[PDB]
Symmetry: none
Subunit: 87 residues, 5 copies
Amino acid sequence: NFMLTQPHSVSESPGKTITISCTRSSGSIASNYVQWYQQRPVPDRFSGSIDSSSNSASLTISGLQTEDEADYYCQSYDSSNPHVVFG
Amino acid sequence: NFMLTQPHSVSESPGKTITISCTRSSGSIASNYVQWYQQRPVPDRFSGSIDSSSNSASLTISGLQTEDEADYYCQSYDSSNPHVVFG
Amino acid sequence: NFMLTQPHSVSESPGKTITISCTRSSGSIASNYVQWYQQRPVPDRFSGSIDSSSNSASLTISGLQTEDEADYYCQSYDSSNPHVVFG
Amino acid sequence: NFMLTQPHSVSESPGKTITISCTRSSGSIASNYVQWYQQRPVPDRFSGSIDSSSNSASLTISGLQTEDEADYYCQSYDSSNPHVVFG
Amino acid sequence: NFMLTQPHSVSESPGKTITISCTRSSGSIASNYVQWYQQRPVPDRFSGSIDSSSNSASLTISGLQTEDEADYYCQSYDSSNPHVVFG
């Protein structure tokens, strides 16, 4: 899958950031995740409860294959040359 | 799947950010996720309860294949050259 | 599927942002997700309850195939060259 | 499916943003999703209750195929070159 | 399906935004979704209740096929070159 779940703030920054190319992924994730992120460049209270959690991630591939003749030709080209003038 | 769920704020930033090309993904995710993100470049109270959660993610592929003669030719070209003038 | 669910704010930023090409995805997601995102470049109260949640995501592919002669030719070209003048 | 559900605000930004091409997706999603997004470039109260939720997402493909001779030729071309003058 | 449900505001931005081409999607979605999005470039109260929700999404394809001789030739061309002058 593609869980692109990122609450990110971007200032004036002409670039490319995340770039994924020619990647193969296959796995299982079971996560109980708690985060308090505080950035201050008055009272703060954080309460997080997960309680009883049952996370199951099962992947089964019972395959059989004869002659494959596999040719995995993955070519990736990425060019990023921004031209930014501030005035 | 494609869970593109990101509450992001972008300032003046001519670019490309996320770019996914020639990628194969197949997996299972079971997530109990809690986040409090605070950025302050008065009273803050965060209460998060998950209680009893049962997350099940099952993937089964019981396949059989004879001669495949697979040829996976994945060619990707990406060009990003912005020209931004501020005045 | 394609769950494109992102409450994003974009300032003056001529670009391309998300770009997905030549991607194959097949999986299962079970998510109990809680987020409080606060950005302040007076009283804030956040209460989130999930209580009893039963998330089930089942994918089954019981297939059988003979000679496939598969040829996966995925060619992608993306060009983005904006010309923005501010005055 | 195509769940294009994004409450996004776009400033003066001549571009292309989301672009999906030559993509194959097949999966199951079970989501209990709660978000409070606050951006302030007086009293704020957020109460969210999911209570008892039963989400089931079942996908079954019990197929059988003989000789396929599959040829997946996916060619995608995207060009975006805006010319914007402000005066 | 095509659930194009996005309450978006677009400023002066000559572009293309969402563009979907040569895509195949087949899946199941079960979503209990709550969002409060606040953007302020006095009292705010948000109350959201889902209570008891039973979401079921079942997809079944019990198919059988002989020799297919499948040839999936998907060619997509997209060109967007706006010329906007402000005066």
